[PDB]
Amino acid sequence: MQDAITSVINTYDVQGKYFDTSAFDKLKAYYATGELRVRAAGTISANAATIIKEASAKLFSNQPDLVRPGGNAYTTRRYAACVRDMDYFLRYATYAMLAGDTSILDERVLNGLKETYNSLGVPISSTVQGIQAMKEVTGSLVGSGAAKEMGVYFDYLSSGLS
Amino acid sequence: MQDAITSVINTYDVQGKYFDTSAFDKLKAYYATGELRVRAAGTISANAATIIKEASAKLFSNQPDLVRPGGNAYTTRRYAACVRDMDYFLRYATYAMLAGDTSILDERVLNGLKETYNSLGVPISSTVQGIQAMKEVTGSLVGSGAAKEMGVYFDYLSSGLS
Amino acid sequence: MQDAITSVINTYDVQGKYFDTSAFDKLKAYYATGELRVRAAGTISANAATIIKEASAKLFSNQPDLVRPGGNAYTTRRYAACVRDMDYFLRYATYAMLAGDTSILDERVLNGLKETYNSLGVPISSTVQGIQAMKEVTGSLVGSGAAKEMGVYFDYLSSGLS
Amino acid sequence: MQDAITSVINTYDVQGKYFDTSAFDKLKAYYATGELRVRAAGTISANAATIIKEASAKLFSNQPDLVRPGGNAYTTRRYAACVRDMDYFLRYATYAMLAGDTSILDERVLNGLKETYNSLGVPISSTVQGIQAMKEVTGSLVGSGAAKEMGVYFDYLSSGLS
Amino acid sequence: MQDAITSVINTYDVQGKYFDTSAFDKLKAYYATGELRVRAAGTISANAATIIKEASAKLFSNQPDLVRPGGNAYTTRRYAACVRDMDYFLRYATYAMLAGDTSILDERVLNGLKETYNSLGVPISSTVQGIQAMKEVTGSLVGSGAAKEMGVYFDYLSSGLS
Amino acid sequence: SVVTKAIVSADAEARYLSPGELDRIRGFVSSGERRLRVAQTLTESRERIIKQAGDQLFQKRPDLVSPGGNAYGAERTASCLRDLDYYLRLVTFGIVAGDVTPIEEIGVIGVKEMYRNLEVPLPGMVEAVKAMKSVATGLLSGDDSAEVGYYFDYLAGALA
Amino acid sequence: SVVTKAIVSADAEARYLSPGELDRIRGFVSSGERRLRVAQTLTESRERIIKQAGDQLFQKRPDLVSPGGNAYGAERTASCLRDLDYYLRLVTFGIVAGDVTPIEEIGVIGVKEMYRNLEVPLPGMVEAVKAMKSVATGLLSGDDSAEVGYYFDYLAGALA
Amino acid sequence: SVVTKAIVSADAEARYLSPGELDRIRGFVSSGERRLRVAQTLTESRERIIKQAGDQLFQKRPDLVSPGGNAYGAERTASCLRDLDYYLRLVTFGIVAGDVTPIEEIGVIGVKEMYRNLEVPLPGMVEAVKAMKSVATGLLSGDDSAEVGYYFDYLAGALA
Amino acid sequence: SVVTKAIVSADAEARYLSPGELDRIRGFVSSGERRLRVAQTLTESRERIIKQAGDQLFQKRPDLVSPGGNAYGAERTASCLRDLDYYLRLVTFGIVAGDVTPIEEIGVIGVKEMYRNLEVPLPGMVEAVKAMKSVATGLLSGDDSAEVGYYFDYLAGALA
Amino acid sequence: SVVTKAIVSADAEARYLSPGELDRIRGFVSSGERRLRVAQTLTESRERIIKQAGDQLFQKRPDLVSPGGNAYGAERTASCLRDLDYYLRLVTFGIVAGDVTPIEEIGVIGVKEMYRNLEVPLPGMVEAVKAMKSVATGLLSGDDSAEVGYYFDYLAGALA
Amino acid sequence: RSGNPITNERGNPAGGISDKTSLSPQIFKLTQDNR
Ligand SMILES: CCC1=C(C)/C(=C/C2=NC(=C\c3[nH]c(/C=C4\NC(=O)[C@H](C)[C@H]4CC)c(C)c3CCC(=O)O)/C(CCC(=O)O)=C2C)NC1=O
Ligand SMILES: CCC1=C(C)/C(=C/C2=NC(=C\c3[nH]c(/C=C4\NC(=O)[C@H](C)[C@H]4CC)c(C)c3CCC(=O)O)/C(CCC(=O)O)=C2C)NC1=O
Ligand SMILES: CCC1=C(C)/C(=C/C2=NC(=C\c3[nH]c(/C=C4\NC(=O)[C@H](C)[C@H]4CC)c(C)c3CCC(=O)O)/C(CCC(=O)O)=C2C)NC1=O
Ligand SMILES: CCC1=C(C)/C(=C/C2=NC(=C\c3[nH]c(/C=C4\NC(=O)[C@H](C)[C@H]4CC)c(C)c3CCC(=O)O)/C(CCC(=O)O)=C2C)NC1=O
Ligand SMILES: CCC1=C(C)/C(=C/C2=NC(=C\c3[nH]c(/C=C4\NC(=O)[C@H](C)[C@H]4CC)c(C)c3CCC(=O)O)/C(CCC(=O)O)=C2C)NC1=O
Ligand SMILES: CCC1=C(C)/C(=C/C2=NC(=C\c3[nH]c(/C=C4\NC(=O)[C@H](C)[C@H]4CC)c(C)c3CCC(=O)O)/C(CCC(=O)O)=C2C)NC1=O
Ligand SMILES: CCC1=C(C)/C(=C/C2=NC(=C\c3[nH]c(/C=C4\NC(=O)[C@H](C)[C@H]4CC)c(C)c3CCC(=O)O)/C(CCC(=O)O)=C2C)NC1=O
């Protein structure tokens, strides 16, 4: 993948220039947030099951028909697939937050995911609501500083599906 | 795949209801036809190579161009490929007949066959003729009652290709 | 992959006919030009590295932006892949010349090549210029007749890409 | 693996003769107990988790040193291996009972099991006690007629280990 | 594998006891030796090529029959295998030294090494002589204090081959 | 179902159904009538089975409806009874299908993930299924009780 | 046998036999007496079945015994009837086993390269097993004739 | 330990330890005494941590000690507290070692199946270990409490 | 062809043709004229070869035309001789190509399944090809017949 | 970089980052300040390093600049020094990234084929890289000299 | 190629066994004693 350090390295290698003051300032900015990112990633890893629990509970409270007969998540198999997809989203959002870049979302999650769901019959809007539920649940646990960072990657996933 | 009993089960699952009189009537219809289906399946399994032999001979007699030089079936390789395709058609039509549903024909056979033949250059008209040849050959072997049941699945394959 | 001899064999097989005078004339023509083909192929095989070096130098001299930062040939790996592609084009033009048919070019080279380069971001016009660079470099080494012979295959590659 | 029917088939095929009255009587004897064997296997299928739980509880109450620190069952991993071994013993005893042959135990279970336990330091005596505990727990539920036919294979396993 | 810390961890886990004063003494001893171990490991890593240089030179000087035709060192691939084996021994001696325990050497280097060398025809005594060559070169290079520590692992490997 | 499993087994090996598979299909088709009678009996008595099974389960495992339990409260007990209704319907599907295939594909694959997500204890599922087994086979005759007990057996073993 | 396949299928997924597997085993052992008396009827009719099957084989396919054919000569005809006896014995084995496995491990696996080694036409083999089917199913009762004929169907399909 | 992980990595891609890894090992060994103080501080406070965590767990989950619950009874509650003591000792071991590998090798590999065999709810386990985190972190200074909270969170995630 | 085979072998190794393939191609193109004459010899007298080979085949295996044989009847005998014509044309194609690639591609890949569907005995095809080889080697003069025999040999080995 | 390597390793196993590799990322983001200072020092003194190393190399290898040499001429010597500038920039990129990955991707993979195409001698490359290592190591402090020499030795070994 | 471009078999028949770069996926090998 490509993180913020590698993003700067690539944008300066393509130009053929050495690191100037602006590049070094970007690197300083990334290194400053490193402790916050590591702390948030550890917190999310510790509480991933709880986050998926509460997010899924809220999503199926707002849209019960998904888990009722005739809903896309009505079976044990399809409910498990739902919570598996939510876990994938949480894990990859954590990866993107650690890296500080959204490249891994585009090349490991969002590559053909919209048409995958369309072919499957998966409701994309309900998936976006689930991602929003995950975001608002995670924000409380990680803290506002880490919540702001997790939000951008959650909305990147949401806009990728939407 | 899906068969008639699983079809009733699946529709009542999606609707989330217990079985009603209509479902039991459908199941009783399948149970009535099942013994005839088993007899026909055993008959076709016994005479598979024979049925393929007369059907291919009839097709290549009606359309001698196929086997002659410049025909799509003119080679040992291409002739064997034609016989292999006909064997697949017979086996999966037998599966559909014994199941009582044509879903296996859609998934395993029909989903992709037209594009495959159009890319390969296979004449779809001649292939429908071969399927009709298998139909009328196997009808005399399975018996009139079983011929009526097998004809719908051969017609399904012919319509899927057409 | 079919050469001139195989092409005649096929055009006589599809008709179901035995060989007659015209087929012997065509094969005699191929046998007549075979010595020129073998000498040219050996010369190109012995001087392949020199041809690639000269043509790559000419191309990167005419289009210096390729090997400068921001060009598609700017990195060690991309420069290596560029000269690797030139080696493909030279080797397969040698094969096509020796066979006397352009089937290997539609068959092993140009099939899906436009899509592959478009996905990679490889410049098409610059690659055509490099194929020419190889053509002018190879003509001098192989002489007038062998250059006239190899020119049809190099122009085939250029037109297929363009 | 071979059951009673496959065993008599092997004997009569190596002897090269058709079935005689003695082998017919042996097949009658097997078919007579087929019903009881199927019923016992069906009972054990439900109670496998409960039987294993109660057997582990009794074995570790009689021998608390195994689970206390320094014991062979002391870790999550080694406790896992212990209960997995008891699961395997119960399942393979059920397989042998339903087959009517003890050969399946020899081919998979008892092939060098003593040497492997001694190599890993597993106490053979406590494994024997675990097998015996599974024996009474299973017999309490299957029924006396099934208890005898299951305890014969349990005794065979215990004697193979000891 | 296990290092010095994990040895104390295991000794206290088997007893089931928490850490006490003696455990802290052992741990502090390892922690104090740690800086010397790290410095020696870095010295070996920087100069590992040179230790191989001198050790191979001395070994082949003492026994020139190996490199000469008919010896076990006579070919480029087999000589490369010879020097790669000494590289293995130096690397794993460094690993065991930095860890502080010899368990890794048992698990990886000497696990079936004598039998494999005997089957391949490798002379155990000559490989041992190479081991003392590396040991003496290391003792010269890293100073006597780290030499005494590295000698333990080197003679462990020597006796394992012996 | 029996037909579906037999056919997929044959298709996985590129062959027609063996005589044993055809004989098994014959037996299933013959027994379909008693299968449907059993399914009707279970379907008609669904509410009594659910009520008695819930009462028996909560008597055997009072912790579930005790404060702090997963089934504490009228709403969560209602959801528990609704799950029991799901599993009874799946059992009837399995009876008419002659196999545990509908039960497996509808309510066994990924059920552990689902109940971990819902904080639902699987052992409680096990005693609930055993209670439904007892109550339902109480209504059925011996031959019917055996076949229904096989399906409740499979479901309890899958949850366990 | 049926029990053998059920046990192997259950063990492959590392699980106890399903209610469907138990149901098929129960149906197999329940019908033990019928298939057993069927095998007794087949085995007590060695030579009638063998000789009539050979007669129909040679009169529908005259060229096997014609000069230049596979069975031309007395000894080759004897070997032909010996193979017929082999396959009849295998059919009895499969009938008692409840499955076509004994025929497979004995007579089906490797039959094509065997008879290609022996230069034995496979259409002749399928004609012979068809004739034996007719002769054997003539003797048996209507219910048992179908059971015999299904195993003969498997053998005929397996040959060619 | 940190040394073990660095060594197994270096062996995996098959070269001597990289200078950065040598820096990491020096940072680890230079901080060993602080880890030893942390481990001793936790050891001195075994009973308070264990009993306060158990009290918090049984306040959040009265059902576990309710009749029919897993930890109902004096002896089963004692086993509960002894399990908490096991995990506290493992956490001290991990703090001394510098990572969580002891906690894996002794307490996480196969914990799910084991507590299934014992019918012990894993949600109860995560609640208990979170309670142990809450108690133990307060005993220590901020820098040390952060490190200990890392291990407690990792164990809680492993249990869940 | 020889050229196509050399090109394919070079492409498999991603290398230009070495002196070995190049001078074998030079030899092949040098000898093309005599290959053309040899092909003309078999082409001009094809019907003689087909009729002689059919006569020899029916002498060796009269059962093919005998009642119950596959060649029984005027039409089926005509189809037999037409197949022999096909294979003679393929052999001439192989001669002009200098390789058995036309023979293999047009008449060897799938020949078993095709003649099995037609129920043609492959051994009879083998004697047919041997008879064709004997006749063709009869017509050709000296070393020429040699290489022709090779092709026929391959075809026989292809069909047996 | 270190962050990317840890994320890729965690993703390949489909798991969250373990506390050990989170500690690795923590150490990396801690060292970021001094590694930026080192990279900035190299960036500021790039012209001095390039001139010094170019002169040192050309004295050590007079054949490269002599007539008939690869770097003979104004333009070719300018290209030589421009390549040195690329590699210095790559070493700065590697220092900021914390691993040799930017160096590998941008200027190591396929370098031998490139310089083989350009008739550029690889021993000259290695000696130029070693000269730059000596010059840089001379210019910056002793503690950071080892870190810079790590990347320079990686590049030298890769080019070797 | 998902990795080094010049490791494709068409150009490089031995590219499959070539040394992995940072462009290639993660490679999982089981060297644990293979007992
Ligand atoms: C047909 C396949 C299928 C099943 C089985 C299924 C079960 C299921 N049960 C649920 C809730 C529930 N299920 C239970 C059941 C438990 N209560 C006690 O602990 C018992 C041990 C146990 C029942 C015997 C409870 C208490 C809830 C409520 C959870 C909550 O309110 O947070 C939910 C959440 C959505 C909702 O409530 O509508 C599902 C999806 N869903 C399916 O698509
Ligand atoms: C160019 C490559 C090629 C070949 C070789 C080929 C063989 C071939 N053999 C055929 C039939 C036949 N082939 C034979 C030959 C047999 N008679 C005796 O048994 C002998 C053992 C043997 C010959 C020595 C016979 C008798 C038939 C007629 C079978 C029938 O009518 O059912 C047919 C069917 C003709 C039609 O349907 O109109 C083909 C296509 N096809 C090809 O594309
Ligand atoms: C014989 C049939 C065949 C062709 C032609 C072929 C081309 C080809 N070129 C590639 C990369 C490349 N090809 C080039 C070459 C271009 N860049 C410069 O601008 C030049 C103008 C131009 C060459 C003259 C470059 C720079 C790359 C690297 C692109 C990348 O790595 O992202 C790749 C992807 C990497 C790989 O797996 O090899 C392919 C498949 N592959 C084939 O199997
Ligand atoms: C399907 C056929 C099969 C069988 C029969 C089987 C038994 C078996 N148990 C084993 C280990 C083990 N077995 C046990 C069980 C012991 N713990 C004690 O408390 C008890 C006395 C006793 C059980 C009642 C334990 C703890 C281990 C692991 C020992 C170790 O890891 O060092 C091993 C060695 C593999 C390993 O290292 O885990 C085998 C082969 N495994 C199989 O795959
Ligand atoms: C139990 C499994 C089994 C089978 C089936 C079997 C068949 C078999 N048949 C053989 C010979 C033979 N078998 C036949 C029979 C053929 N003749 C006609 O074409 C018929 C179509 C057909 C029989 C219905 C003939 C003619 C031979 C003699 C072939 C020769 O001379 O080599 C032989 C060689 C031994 C001998 O010659 O005495 C075997 C092994 N062996 C086995 O272990
Ligand atoms: C070092 C790794 C290791 C662990 C962790 C371990 C745990 C463990 N806990 C056990 C029992 C138990 N463990 C518990 C604890 C549970 N009760 C619930 O309320 C709580 C959520 C939870 C504790 C916080 C209980 C109640 C029992 C008694 C179960 C019984 O005997 O039926 C047992 C069975 C032996 C015994 O009864 O003493 C083991 C092996 N053993 C090990 O070797
Ligand atoms: C960022 C990665 C990268 C590298 C490394 C790279 C190297 C590179 N060096 C080149 C020229 C050159 N490079 C050299 C360097 C050599 N002269 C002496 O022999 C020395 C041993 C040695 C340098 C220390 C020379 C002499 C040339 C001119 C070649 C010519 O024009 O014939 C060229 C041809 C294109 C151009 O001149 O603009 C490339 C692609 N390109 C890249 O994109």
- On whether the CB atoms of residues G65 and G58 are closer than 8 A, the answer is yes
A and B touching (3 or more beta-carbon pairs closer than 8 Å):
yes
The chains found to touch J (3+ Cβ pairs under 8 angstroms) are A, C, H, K
- On whether the CB atoms of residues A132 and A154 are closer than 8 A, the answer is yes
Residue-wise DSSP of J3-49: HHHHHHHHHHTTSPPPHHHHHHHHHHHHHHHHHHHHHHHHHHTHHHH
- The amino acid occupying position B81 is A
Q: Which two tokens stand for residue E42?
A: 């870095």
- Nearest CA to D59 out of D46, D69, D72, D47 is that of D72
Looking at the complex, report in whole angstroms how far the Cα of residue H135 sits from the nearest Cα belonging to chain F. Answer: 22
d(CA E35, CA A32): 30
- Nearest CA to J93 out of J7, J11, J154, J6 is that of J154
- Nearest CA to F16 out of B4, B48, G8 is that of B48
d(CA C159, CA C132): 11
**Which three-class secondary structure state does DSSP give residue G69?**
coil
- On whether the CB atoms of residues B154 and B131 are closer than 8 A, the answer is yes
Ligand nearest to the CA of D73: 4
Ligand nearest to the CA of H122: 6
d(CA A109, CA E146): 51
G64 lines ligand 5 (CB under 6 A): yes
- Nearest CA to G148 out of G86, G94, G102 is that of G94
Query: Which DSSP helix (H) or strand (E) runs through I129?
Result: helix I122-139
Residue F65 burial by Cβ neighbours in a 10 Å radius (0-12, 13-18, 19+): buried
- Nearest CA to E83 out of E127, E123, E43, E114 is that of E127
DSSP collapsed to 3 states, chain B: CCCHHHHHHHHHHHHCCCCCHHHHHHHHHHHHHHHHHHHHHHHHHHCHHHHHHHHHHHHHHHCCCCCCCCCCCCCHHHHHHHHHHHHHHHHHHHHHHHHCCCHHHHHHHHCCHHHHHHHHCCCHHHHHHHHHHHHHHHHHHHCHHHHHHHHHHHHHHHHHHC
- On whether the CB atoms of residues H131 and H56 are closer than 8 A, the answer is yes
* DSSP category for residue I15: -
Ligand nearest to the CA of J123: 7
For a substitution probing ligand 6, which of H79, H106, H126, H152 has the most ligand atoms within 8 Å of its CB? H79
d(CA C5, CA A135): 68
- The amino acid occupying position C81 is A
J121 lines ligand 7 (CB under 6 A): yes
d(CA K9, CA K20): 14
G89 lines ligand 5 (CB under 6 A): no
Q: Is the dihedral of CA I64, I65, I69, I71 positive or negative?
A: positive
d(CA D78, CA D68): 12
d(CA I108, CA B76): 6
CA distances from F149 to E71, F135, G2, J122 (A): 76, 11, 23, 79
Which residues in chain D have their CB less than 8 angstroms from residue G17's CB? 41, 45, 98
Count of alpha carbons within 13 angstroms of residue A150, beta-carbon side: 30
Calculate ∠ Cα A52-A109-A127, nearest 5°.
45
Q: Which two tokens stand for residue F101?
A: 């295939």
C70-75: long-range pairs with CB below 8 Å, 24+ = C70/A14, C70/A15, C70/A16, C72/C121, C72/C122, C72/C123, C72/C126, C74/A14, C75/J105, C75/J106, C75/J107, C75/J109, C75/J110
- Which atom of ligand 1 is found nearest the CA of F61? 21
d(CA B32, CA F30): 9
d(CA F74, CA F77): 5
Chain F residue with minimal CA distance to D50? F160
Count of alpha carbons within 13 angstroms of residue I4, beta-carbon side: 20
Q: How many residues does chain I have?
A: 160
CB-based contact, F114 to chain A, within 8 Å: yes
CA B17 – ligand 5 centroid, Å: 61
Residue J26 burial by Cβ neighbours in a 10 Å radius (0-12, 13-18, 19+): middle
Which residues fall within 8 angstroms of residue H70, CB to CB, at 6 or more apart? Answer: F63, H64, H76, H119, H120, H121, H124
Q: Does E27 contact H93 at a Cβ distance shorter than 8 Å?
A: no
d(CA E97, CA E152): 9
Looking at the complex, report in whole angstroms how far the Cα of residue C70 sits from the nearest Cα belonging to chain A. Answer: 5
CB-based contact, K24 to chain C, within 8 Å: no
- On whether the CB atoms of residues I14 and K10 are closer than 8 A, the answer is yes
- Nearest CA to G129 out of G49, G9, G39, G41 is that of G49
- On whether the CB atoms of residues E129 and E62 are closer than 8 A, the answer is yes
Chain C residue with minimal CA distance to J90? C75
* DSSP category for residue K6: G
d(CA I27, CA G128): 55
Tell me how far apart the 2 most distant CA atoms of chain E are, in Å. 62
Q: Does A68 contact B16 at a Cβ distance shorter than 8 Å?
A: yes
Which residues fall within 8 angstroms of residue J89, CB to CB, at 6 or more apart? Answer: A13, A18, J46
For the CA atoms of J43, J45, J50, J55, what is the dihedral angle to 10 degrees?
Answer: -170
Which residues fall within 8 angstroms of residue J144, CB to CB, at 6 or more apart? Answer: J34, J37, J38, J41
- On whether the CB atoms of residues B29 and F96 are closer than 8 A, the answer is no
Residues in contact with ligand 4 by the CB-under-6-Å rule are D 66, 72-73, 78, 81-82, 85-86, 88, 108-109, 113, 116, 120, 122-123, 126-127, 130
Query: Both ends of chain I: CA-CA distance in Å?
Result: 24
CB-based contact, H159 to chain F, within 8 Å: no
CA I131 – ligand 2 centroid, Å: 17
- The amino acid occupying position F137 is T
Residue C56 burial by Cβ neighbours in a 10 Å radius (0-12, 13-18, 19+): buried
Chain-centre distance of CA C95, in angstroms? 8
d(CA D101, CA B113): 49
Q: Residues of J62-89 as b/e, b for ≥16 C-beta within 10 angstroms?
A: eebbeeebbbeeeeebeebbebbbbbbb
The number of beta carbons lying within 10 Å of the beta carbon of residue C22 is: 10
**Which three-class secondary structure state does DSSP give residue G40?**
helix
C74 lines ligand 7 (CB under 6 A): yes
- Nearest CA to D137 out of D62, D38, D49 is that of D49
d(CA F24, CA G5): 13
For the CA atoms of G48, G49, G53, G54, what is the dihedral angle to 10 degrees?
Answer: -50
d(CA D76, CA K35): 23
Tokens 């068969």 identify what position? B3
I125 lines ligand 2 (CB under 6 A): yes
CA H119 – ligand 6 centroid, Å: 9
Query: Both ends of chain F: CA-CA distance in Å?
Result: 23
d(CA J159, CA J87): 11
Q: Which two tokens stand for residue J23?
A: 């500690």
The number of beta carbons lying within 10 Å of the beta carbon of residue H145 is: 17
Q: What is the CA radius of gyration of chain K?
A: 12
Query: Which DSSP helix (H) or strand (E) runs through C113?
Result: helix C113-120
- On whether the CB atoms of residues H50 and E18 are closer than 8 A, the answer is no
